[PDB]
Write a protein that binds this ligand. Structure first.
Ligand SMILES: [Ca+2]
Length: 131
């Protein structure tokens, strides 16, 4: 299950709805493997080329939005640091998209409440203010 999750995630070189939807189902059905999935998405975000890091963030977004706990909690831990580094490594067009994504996280328009609890969102906001 994990190896598949990983290879499908290597093919995420564009904004593929299918792939994202697929990764989201795998995470949803294998809660036992949560963390390995988070591990894998974070690894991808941290290591792939600057211009595809965004799609890995999309996959991260979908899983947290459509599955929720315990992924929201797990992703919370490195959210800010992964977000900051990504922002600093990509072009302005991509930054705009990163920011729109952060806005939905605060006001998921919604069900109405921080998709992420803890300090992650506050830190991102303060970073965006200064940067
Ligand atoms: Ca700013």
């Amino acid at each position: 299950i994990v190896k598949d999750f990983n290879s499908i995630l290597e093919e995420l070189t564009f904004n593929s709805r299918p792939i994202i939807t697929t990764l989201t189902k795998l995470a949803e059905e294998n809660i036992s493997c949560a963390q390995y999935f988070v591990d894998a998405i974070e690894s991808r975000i941290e290591k792939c080329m600057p211009k595809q890091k965004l799609y890995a963030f999309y996959a991260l977004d979908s899983i947290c939005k459509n599955v929720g706990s315990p992924y929201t909690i797990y992703f919370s831990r490195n959210l800010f640091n992964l977000y900051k580094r990504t922002y600093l490594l990509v072009d302005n067009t991509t930054r705009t998209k990163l920011i729109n994504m952060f806005k939905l996280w605060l006001n998921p328009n919604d069900t109405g409440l921080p998709l992420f609890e803890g300090s992650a969102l506050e830190k991102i906001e303060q970073f965006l203010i200064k940067a």
